Amino acid sequence: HGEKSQAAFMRMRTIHWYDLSWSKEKVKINETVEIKGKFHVFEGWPETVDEPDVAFLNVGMPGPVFIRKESYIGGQLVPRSVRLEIGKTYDFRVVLKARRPGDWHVHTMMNVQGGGPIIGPGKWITVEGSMSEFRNPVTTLTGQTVDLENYNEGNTYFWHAFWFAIGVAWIGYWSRRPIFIPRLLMVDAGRADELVSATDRKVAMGFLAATILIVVMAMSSANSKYPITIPLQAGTMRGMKPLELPAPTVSVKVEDATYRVPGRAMRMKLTITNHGNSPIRLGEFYTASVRFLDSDVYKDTTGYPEDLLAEDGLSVSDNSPLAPGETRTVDVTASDAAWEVYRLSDIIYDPDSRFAGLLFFFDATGNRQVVQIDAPLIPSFM
Amino acid sequence: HGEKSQAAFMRMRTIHWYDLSWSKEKVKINETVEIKGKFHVFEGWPETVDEPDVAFLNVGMPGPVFIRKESYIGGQLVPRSVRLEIGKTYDFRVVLKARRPGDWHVHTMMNVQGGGPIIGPGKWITVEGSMSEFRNPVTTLTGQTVDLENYNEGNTYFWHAFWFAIGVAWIGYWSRRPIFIPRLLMVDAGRADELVSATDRKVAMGFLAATILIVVMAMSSANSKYPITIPLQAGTMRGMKPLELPAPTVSVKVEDATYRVPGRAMRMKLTITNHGNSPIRLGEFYTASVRFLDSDVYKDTTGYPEDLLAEDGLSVSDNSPLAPGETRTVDVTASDAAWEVYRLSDIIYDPDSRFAGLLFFFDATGNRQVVQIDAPLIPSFM
Amino acid sequence: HGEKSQAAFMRMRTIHWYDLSWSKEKVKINETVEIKGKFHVFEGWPETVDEPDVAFLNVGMPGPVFIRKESYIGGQLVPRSVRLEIGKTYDFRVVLKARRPGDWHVHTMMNVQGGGPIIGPGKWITVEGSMSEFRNPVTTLTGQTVDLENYNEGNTYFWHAFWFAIGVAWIGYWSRRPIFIPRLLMVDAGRADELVSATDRKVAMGFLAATILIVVMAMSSANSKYPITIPLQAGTMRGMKPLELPAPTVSVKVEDATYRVPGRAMRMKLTITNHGNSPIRLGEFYTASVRFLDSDVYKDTTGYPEDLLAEDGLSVSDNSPLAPGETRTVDVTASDAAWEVYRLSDIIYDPDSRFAGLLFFFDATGNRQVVQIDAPLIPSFM
């Protein structure tokens, strides 16, 4: 939730999430779900979004209904912010543990500093069980195993209640006497010195000394109880390993790209050159989490969110085997209610009417090439 | 105009504009002139100029004597700011349309954010005709063809005059009575409440209600008249395609570079190694829009501004065919009044006495190699 | 001095200084000492240190006990700040001239803007002689040879004394009369106009006119005496040539890296793959200026500061010739008091417990390969 309201061109021109898998659709409490996939950083990064020099891989959900057990970018655990390069592709994996029952829309997201949220496709996952069964065991380097759900709760309650009680007692010591009107009149009359006695001064001195001594003793006792402590671990982790992918033996030029403004579709003229890899055929156009597929060339079998999957939303004028070398100019039409449901038609309000997306080409043997396209998008009103 | 006053080293060390062409020297009104060329970004970019992450290709002229019909960087239209990389070469093309008659010095420039203006060579172009014949037709996506010279002029005049008249009427309603002295005396005397009557309150209420209602009705009518509107299109366009140029089979090292301070020339010792490409010969040294040529090796036939063209300003101690492999140390002398006219001799006031420029080598067949040189420049006073 | 107090991980993860040489250990006054070596910029640059876009090569010493005659980065003189790229290796050379007698700990350092100091290994150098024998001759472009120790000293003294005397005379002219109490009483009594006479006004006018005229005449005389002047030369020098080094035919993966917190050592599990270059053997681990060596494989003969040299501080479970192709998992133990002396054990207070260093592999013929390792460092308390 939160993507439909984001500018259409910003969603089109930031990060592209390609083949994704979810290990389970329905999980029990304390069971783990794995979300893996690839994300590509668009070369034409918008200028109002800072470069992903400081980026964090996040899980979009209405709260800690899951707990993120681990997250890996390129096989490396990433508990901190990371640095990503423009134009590179990265594998990502996220292992989550179920905490609260219910149906949850879970998304993979990249939070970018100086940019904001970049939400990926969301999937509905059902958690069955009771929240009381959730456990979060962690073993420390000191040899102690604790449960993070209730660890250190009683100590915090005790100390906060103790200090609150001390403050309440300090206020109530003075609250046993007339408070506001008689004291104000006495101060106005010049009898302020009569409002504080020697016993009050002794009580204040005792309160101050007891507070300081208790703080010192509590710090000493806490140090004795936990002689091994480390500061909070923070920093930006550089040197993320990107994917070394086969360059596309397929070249695609966008002649024109238009959308009818009333409109639930997008149309584009494309010149495609096959540089080998056998006769190929376009099977899918990915724009903003929406996948328009050509049923005759490719069929999704990964449980891609159906609200974002158009099984026959790709209409190519001529989708015949493009013999290696053939340069065919084709008119592709990406049509689906998701265009209007995911407010991609709101590119009419955007201060930049340019789109970007991914095209997937398959040969007879099923090998897939990914081609990256970007162009300006012209609205049609006649 | 405006380059002679810019620091000499800043002009030497920012952008180099090489082979340029102008389609016409004399044009009529509504006729188009094309300026094409190449620009190279110097690797040793000055630190006080921000990197050209946000750069705009501009035309330097005393105003809209021309209208910039289009501009292309690397074959791509660039109506917005663009991103350029240090050390890369780009083709540029600018098509302008003549608007006002007269002789105009036209320059190609790169405005760089956090840096300032980078002016290129200027050429004198004559426009013949009358300004009243200039037309700027534009066809909108709604099917309307308009002339940008006078489009929406009457509407703006009408609305501004209407609101100015309303304000004048509001002031003049109160201006029919004594204004300053009697009213001031009455307010001082305590008779302020007598200065505003019930009729005045009713008039003020009517003015407020009429203003609000007129604004609302005008907005509704404007929306009805123009139901299709888009916001201003802005942004920085990345992914500019640079030139893939042959690396210079010629290696040049600058041993020493000196200039006499009184002085109208510059001298340099150079070690040149030919790595193939047949016997070569230096034909031209480009510094800051000034081209020093060796008449025996090369002759300009592009109509390069004569104030910046020194046909025999390159004197090479030995400019004989440098057999592939020969490593000759030569003393080159670049001499021309342009050195003093374009205030390149003002490098003596610069907080950085280092120069940069381009050397052009030609073989027997006429093939040209471009070598890029940079060195510190030492003034000579004895 | 000043490195032991710097965070251990910051010292481990910034710049690595490898093979270094000092021309002399004991020098006389006016004699020169050359310090050469290589420095590598770590790829995982810490986020709290700005990238070395503006870096200066500096000499760490308690003052001008030496004078830095020259400094070269990649064979190019670097009197100004320079730009360095992450992940590149550079040669550096520094020629210093002895000025003051005594024993001096001299370090090579890289000052990085927005980062702070990066100190390299320090060496003790003895200077014998008298400071009065030190000379700093410099020949100007005007044909004058001067000594920078005493040049322009007398002129500065004369002008400062002259202006101070003028100010003292101005104060003392008024100081001959009663100063504070009688004047205050007269001003309070309303007799302020009697405290300044016409002669005082004439004296003030003469002082003002003389000051302005003297300033103008002094400027004119200084211009006449030195008709050739240049502004201060400043700027950041880009285009530093890095080393083109053989990629390591040796691959090393860090399985685990741990340190006992009481502790004077560090332990690591490593998987090493030989990709040719004959049977190899680990001979040295460089962490933070500390070099742990395996005496049986390599011996230092460069006079590396002994406080930072552990001749037998590298213990490899199996350090037998790793036949090209062999993938051996070995347990290496780097032990030395320098770990505690140079406060590398203070990584326990660091907000980032990750280390980086260099491994040196030698074959039978003595050829050396440098492998770069980085990992998180886990403290052991049991």
Ligand SMILES: CCCCCCC/C=C/CCCCCCCC(=O)OC[C@H](COP(=O)(O)OCCN)OC(=O)CCCCCCCCCCCCCCC
């Ligand atoms: C829950 C209260 C709201 C917020 C409390 C915030 C800070 C505390 C303020 C007052 C503390 C001192 C009590 C008054 C002097 C406590 C005090 O003096 O009690 C005797 C009073 C005074 O004697 P008197 O002049 O002969 O009688 C006048 C009132 N009948 O008599 C009483 O019968 C008791 C009345 C006082 C009861 C108020 C207690 C509520 C405060 C404790 C709340 C603790 C929880 C805090 C978080 C919400």
Ligand SMILES: CCCCCCC/C=C/CCCCCCCC(=O)OC[C@H](COP(=O)(O)OCCN)OC(=O)CCCCCCCCCCCCCCC
């Ligand atoms: C690092 C330097 C210290 C900071 C400088 C200021 C220090 C001030 C000193 C007092 C100067 C005022 C004159 C008072 C003369 C001595 C003095 O302390 O008198 C009591 C004064 C009231 O002043 P007075 O009676 O008119 O003074 C005349 C002689 N008694 O109250 C206080 O000082 C505050 C309340 C009583 C203090 C008891 C200790 C509790 C507070 C400290 C914590 C102790 C427990 C430590 C935990 C381990």
Ligand SMILES: CCCCCCC/C=C/CCCCCCCC(=O)OC[C@H](COP(=O)(O)OCCN)OC(=O)CCCCCCCCCCCCCCC
């Ligand atoms: C061009 C004027 C300069 C700038 C104007 C700026 C804002 C407007 C100020 C005054 C408007 C109300 C007029 C006075 C009450 C208009 C008004 O009350 O007119 C009757 C006056 C007053 O009657 P009275 O007391 O019996 O006579 C005294 C003056 N003789 O009599 C007149 O004979 C007319 C004199 C007033 C003429 C001034 C008009 C100029 C202002 C309109 C300019 C519009 C263009 C604006 C942009 C420049």
Ligand SMILES: CCCCCCC/C=C/CCCCCCCC(=O)OC[C@H](COP(=O)(O)OCCN)OC(=O)CCCCCCCCCCCCCCC
């Ligand atoms: C979103 C919330 C609204 C903002 C809150 C403030 C609103 C204020 C309300 C009035 C409170 C003061 C008491 C007045 C009582 C009602 C009232 O409006 O009285 C007239 C008052 C003068 O006060 P009064 O006579 O002593 O009031 C006693 C009873 N009449 O003048 C005004 O309110 C201003 C001038 C007359 C207003 C006429 C409408 C023109 C202005 C609004 C635009 C209407 C056209 C819309 C275009 C589509």
Ligand SMILES: CCCCCCC/C=C/CCCCCCCC(=O)OC[C@H](COP(=O)(O)OCCN)OC(=O)CCCCCCCCCCCCCCC
């Ligand atoms: C070294 C002094 C410290 C700093 C000086 C800073 C600025 C100068 C202040 C005073 C200058 C005017 C002198 C007084 C009027 C100089 C002046 O009027 O001298 C005659 C006085 C006054 O005559 P009187 O009323 O009959 O006698 C009263 C004092 N006996 O008599 C004297 O016997 C001389 C006393 C004055 C000597 C003070 C001189 C010190 C100042 C010069 C220092 C220069 C070095 C500067 C850097 C440190």
Ligand SMILES: CCCCCCC/C=C/CCCCCCCC(=O)OC[C@H](COP(=O)(O)OCCN)OC(=O)CCCCCCCCCCCCCCC
């Ligand atoms: C660029 C524009 C200049 C700045 C504008 C202000 C200039 C002010 C002028 C004076 C106006 C006040 C009326 C005084 C009338 C003329 C005048 O100068 O009178 C003397 C006034 C005192 O005023 P007054 O006697 O009541 O004036 C009545 C007629 N004399 O003192 C001063 O002006 C200051 C002290 C005397 C000046 C002598 C010259 C020394 C200062 C200047 C440097 C000269 C040497 C140059 C070196 C090459």
Ligand SMILES: CCCCCCC/C=C\CCCCCCCC(=O)OC[C@H](COP(=O)(O)OCCN)OC(=O)CCCCCCCCCCCCCCC
């Ligand atoms: C959450 C836990 C709540 C803690 C509650 C603590 C109690 C707080 C205040 C008690 C007020 C009694 C005032 C009696 C003066 C009532 C009073 O003033 O009585 C006259 C005495 C006469 O004493 P004397 O013998 O003639 O002279 C002194 C030596 N003999 O004067 C005084 O000066 C008596 C001073 C006594 C002050 C006691 C207050 C100390 C409170 C510290 C509390 C510590 C916090 C808890 C620790 C875990």
Ligand SMILES: CCCCCCC/C=C\CCCCCCCC(=O)OC[C@H](COP(=O)(O)OCCN)OC(=O)CCCCCCCCCCCCCCC
């Ligand atoms: C650029 C175009 C210029 C537009 C010029 C607009 C004219 C402006 C002001 C007229 C002043 C007349 C004042 C008469 C009070 C003169 C006045 O006060 O007369 C006494 C009346 C008595 O009226 P009554 O009948 O006894 O009671 C009300 C119901 N019957 O009192 C009032 O309260 C009369 C109020 C009348 C106010 C009229 C002003 C409205 C002006 C709106 C202009 C709209 C803008 C143009 C639209 C395109």
Ligand SMILES: CCCCCCC/C=C\CCCCCCCC(=O)OC[C@H](COP(=O)(O)OCCN)OC(=O)CCCCCCCCCCCCCCC
């Ligand atoms: C470090 C070097 C130190 C320099 C010391 C300079 C001496 C400073 C002040 C002298 C005070 C004498 C005051 C006499 C008034 C004492 C005074 O006021 O005497 C009455 C005269 C009467 O003169 P008169 O003839 O009747 O009228 C004028 C034409 N004839 O009035 C005046 O107005 C006299 C004005 C004389 C003022 C002289 C002060 C000029 C000082 C400039 C110094 C230059 C700096 C050094 C250059 C290298």
Ligand SMILES: [Cu+2]
């Ligand atoms: Cu959602």
Ligand SMILES: [Cu+2]
């Ligand atoms: Cu992409």
Ligand SMILES: [Cu+2]
């Ligand atoms: Cu010009």
Ligand SMILES: [Cu+2]
């Ligand atoms: Cu260049």
Ligand SMILES: [Cu+2]
């Ligand atoms: Cu030291």
Ligand SMILES: [Cu+2]
């Ligand atoms: Cu390194």
